[PDB]
Amino acid sequence: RGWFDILDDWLKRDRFVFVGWSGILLFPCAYLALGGWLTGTTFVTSWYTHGLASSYLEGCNFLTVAVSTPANSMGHSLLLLWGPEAQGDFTRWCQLGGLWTFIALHGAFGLIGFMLRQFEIARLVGVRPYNAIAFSAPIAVFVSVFLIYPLGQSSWFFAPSFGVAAIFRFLLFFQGFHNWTLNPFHMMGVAGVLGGALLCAIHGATVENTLFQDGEGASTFRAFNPTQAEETYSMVTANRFWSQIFGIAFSNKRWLHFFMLFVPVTGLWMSAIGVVGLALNLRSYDFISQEIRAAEDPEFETFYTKNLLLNEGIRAWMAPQDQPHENFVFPEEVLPRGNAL
Amino acid sequence: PLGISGTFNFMIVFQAEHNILMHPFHQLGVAGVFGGALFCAMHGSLVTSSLIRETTETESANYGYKFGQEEETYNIVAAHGYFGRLIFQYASFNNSRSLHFFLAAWPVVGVWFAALGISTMAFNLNGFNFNHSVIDAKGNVINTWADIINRANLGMEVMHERNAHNFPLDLA
Amino acid sequence: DIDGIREPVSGSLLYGNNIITGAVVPSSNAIGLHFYPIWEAASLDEWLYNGGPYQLI
Amino acid sequence: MEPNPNRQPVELNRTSLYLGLLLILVLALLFSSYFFN
């Protein structure tokens, strides 16, 4: 009794596709972000914003298509369809890069929707909401890379564009301008991601190679029953093995799995902090001691200064086409180049 | 090189000469470590989330598990139920053996391909090259993001080992 | 002299590196794929100039 | 003075100490280059 309660009943039914209250936000925003990306990569250009072809329609392939950021002149305009720039014209809206803020924002609210879904289903099933909590890391990464980072810069233009090659360009840009590989926050990110992959692999393999024989089949998958009380593999044998091979080993299964949550989640969070620094060009770009020494001493060389030379190359050779709004003209004679090349 | 910045040097020069970002084996490698990280957090959080109550509020939940105990320490049925409702019932693993096999296989295969990426780009079979792939009706080049990548790669190429080349092509 | 052009690159802590810039530097391009154990060198000083440690390690 | 009933003993087991120390020492090994700059 009461439309609210009736509605709650309906939203929370155990259908094939759980809806929930969270679905009211999640499904339209997710669908619009995905649909926006497919629409854009299939039909939409980046000629007027970047001087780039970016769709299947223009001849790009899966690797090179993208929905690109708006032109630098748009600033951090929300670029709403009915806003002052597009004035309700869908075509000009596409041409002005509207699909980029469309996808970024519907995508953000979608991510919110999804994490809310994780909470709602956790609450309805009766389990602890650790999955949601862990999803905080994708959130931090998306919000910092796609929102905060360009908000700190001149405009949406320098946000990542939504495509494969575009993202690769984003990587190379961050190397050339931010020296992002040198940043200890990125390093912690890398450690969390590769350490996560390591834990995934090693844990999977370990369980699969300390299994109890619980059937007669040579394919061992059938010998498991979801409602069984017994562990399906030997924690004791696994512990002895890793203690003897690597010196240390898990002995607590609960700690093992919490740690598997903790490592990549913590990594992504750290990388997000670094990117927030980069929004302001607050980079880990140089070691001042290195520069003072190298400036005074033309025989002093390290991998650090070598990499700075590579970066300088990147900036000079890539900036005119990558930042067209600057109207850079770099005569041949000013381009940095080593011998012969 | 056996060092941190040296590793970055190696990577950048590698990208200059082989366009490894556009190589599908490196891409599979990324799918493997991104995926590995994702599934790591996923497994971790699900198992964590369905631990059977064995402790009070003032002690670590971990004391709820004793080393060598015969019973499973979490509710795999609850975990499965959650994960199946989160997506749909069938993307979920109800079989722990298949689940753990997947956890081993995804990053191991991905990384195998990463290794094969480096090991084949060793013989200069490089990433995809779409430089000037899109041309207009007159013949003007219409740049794509591939071409911007090419400009960055050019920066790296011309600057690397600045005193080592005497001839116009870097054939090794 | 990593690239074999008599342009030696410093990798160690005592020669001006920190943890992030430090490296054991790859052996010289003049060596190429030649096997360069300590006993192929005329001296440890030579060996070090040419990146022998990298190969050993 | 009535003793406070809300008090609770605190623990750090040895494995937690090793993990913690590892975390601190590795963080330090990482950030120290940037502290010296």
Partner: peptide
């Protein structure tokens, strides 16, 4: 003193490896 710091921290980490392996709390079966 920078070099001494880097090497000090490293040395402590190795020491920690030694204690964490040979002076771990022994796993015990219940």
């Amino acid at each position: 003193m920078e070099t001494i710091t880097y090497v000090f921290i490293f040395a402590c980490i190795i020491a920690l490896f030694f204690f964490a392996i040979f002076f771990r709390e022994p796993p015990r079966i219940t």
